[PDB]
Write a protein that binds this ligand. Structure first.
Ligand SMILES: CC(=O)N[C@@H]1[C@@H](O)[C@@H](O)[C@@H](CO)O[C@@H]1O
Ligand SMILES: [Ca+2]
Length: 217
């Protein structure tokens, strides 16, 4: 039940669940949700809300799709903006971004706090201090920006960044990171429309694996 159940993946780690996988947790309003726990990376206990690996799932989707979530437990997914708000409402959550290139190199970025607001505030990004990591810092530039999709433009550009750049993100004018962009498979000639993290591999290289995840601070 909600009374005795886990709130997040750290609670599950503490209860002796040591392998990564899908588990039921209870949101602050006691609604049950099935989530992916990363128990292996950097001490474990992370709740994963985005995962790319192979380009099998189309990420160029509308407001509705990003609001509710889409994809597969067996592969690539976005957990859903309503879900991500709920998960980050209580206490304080640290953010980790894990990346792998096609040459086999693993890179990461960590932030000391992370929250997204409710739909009334367009799922606005509230981001704390950059801690470090081999991937460098390409998200601070997005702090305090609304979320935008192709059919709903909340960015700070006279243009439509989500359409430019073929993704969905807390776009500014327009981005330093674009992890929901096209699965372009390494180097690409088109500018800034792939799975890009500009502080590491720049605007013309699309990563093999991307993963975004949270843990109580
Ligand atoms: C993709 C994106 O937004 N790229 C911009 C680019 O268009 C230009 O404005 C530059 C100037 O500092 O800053 C970024 O690299
Ligand atoms: Ca705009």
């Amino acid at each position: 039940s909600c009374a005795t159940g886990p709130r997040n993946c750290k609670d599950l780690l503490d209860r002796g669940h040591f392998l990564s996988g899908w588990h039921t947790i209870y949101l602050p309003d006691c609604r049950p949700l099935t989530v992916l726990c990363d128990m292996d990376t950097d001490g474990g206990g992370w709740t994963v809300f985005q995962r790319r690996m192979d380009g099998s799932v189309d990420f160029y989707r509308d407001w509705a799709a990003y609001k509710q979530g889409f994809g597969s437990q067996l592969g690539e997914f976005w957990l859903g903006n309503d879900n991500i708000h709920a998960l980050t409402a209580q206490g304080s959550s640290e953010l980790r971004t894990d990346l792998v290139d096609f040459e086999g190199n693993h890179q990461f970025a960590k932030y000391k706090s992370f929250k997204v607001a409710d739909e009334a505030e367009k799922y606005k990004l509230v981001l704390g201090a950059f801690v470090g990591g081999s991937a460098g810092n390409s998200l601070t530039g997005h702090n305090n920006n609304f979320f935008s999709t192709k059919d709903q433009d909340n960015d700070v550009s006279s243009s439509n960044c989500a359409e430019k750049f073929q993704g969905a993100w807390w776009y500014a004018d327009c981005h330093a990171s674009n992890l929901n962009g096209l699965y372009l498979m390494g180097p690409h000639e088109s500018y800034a429309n792939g799975i890009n993290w500009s502080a590491a591999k720049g605007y013309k290289y699309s990563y093999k694996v991307s993963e975004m995840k949270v843990r109580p601070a």
